[PDB]
Amino acid sequence: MTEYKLVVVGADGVGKSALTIQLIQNHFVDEYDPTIEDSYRKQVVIDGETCLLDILDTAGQEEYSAMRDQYMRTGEGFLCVFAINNTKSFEDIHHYREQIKRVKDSEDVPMVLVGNKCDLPSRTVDTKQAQDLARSYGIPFIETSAKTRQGVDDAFYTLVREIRKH
């Protein structure tokens, strides 16, 4: 039995809350309720190990950006979420990744690049663009949908596997 402190980060509206609520409660939140800070818990078996996921759902709003330092210091692994219909959110990954590396004084932080909202009929951020970014960071890239559950379990489980490896 091992606890893993996971942090879900990204721009305001990429679907951080919807991804976490889908993982835990098995349902899609269609509403847009801006987050200040919430934490969720999930006990799952990953590679025969009982994993106690302590998931922090953070604010995309810059209004609460001062809270970032303490949670980045405490967090073991990070899901860096952008939406596939939002180029700006994809560009923001660099700024989130830079802050995490600086605060933790480490370039080798367990991290997973998450391209959310892949259920959408149209896309602005190409799969190859995101694969190339993940390859440049040396981290895994997983396409997800908080609506259909596409890649949601793989995103969180892969992050746990990155923490264990580190």
Ligand SMILES: O=C1N[C@H](c2c(CNCc3ccc4ccn(Cc5ccccc5)c4c3)[nH]c3ccccc23)c2cc(O)ccc21
């Ligand atoms: O040291 C910290 N731990 C916070 C934390 C959690 C919460 N652990 C589970 C837990 C236990 C005891 C209570 C008592 C009340 N709550 C509700 C609660 C919800 C959200 C935020 C705080 C409290 C609790 C929730 N998971 C993380 C995953 C990655 C990084 C940091 C955390 C946290 C948040 C923060 O911004 C700064 C520093 C820390």
Ligand SMILES: Nc1nc2c(ncn2[C@@H]2O[C@H](COP(=O)(O)OP(=O)(O)CP(=O)(O)O)[C@@H](O)[C@H]2O)c(=O)[nH]1
């Ligand atoms: N079609 C689709 N919509 C999604 C998906 N994930 C989230 N959404 C939608 O996007 C909107 C924002 O989702 P939300 O989870 O609140 O984003 P957030 O990043 O937590 C917003 P904040 O940073 O302010 O907390 C909601 O209307 C939600 O239904 C998805 O995978 N597919």
Ligand SMILES: [Mg+2]
């Ligand atoms: Mg939210």
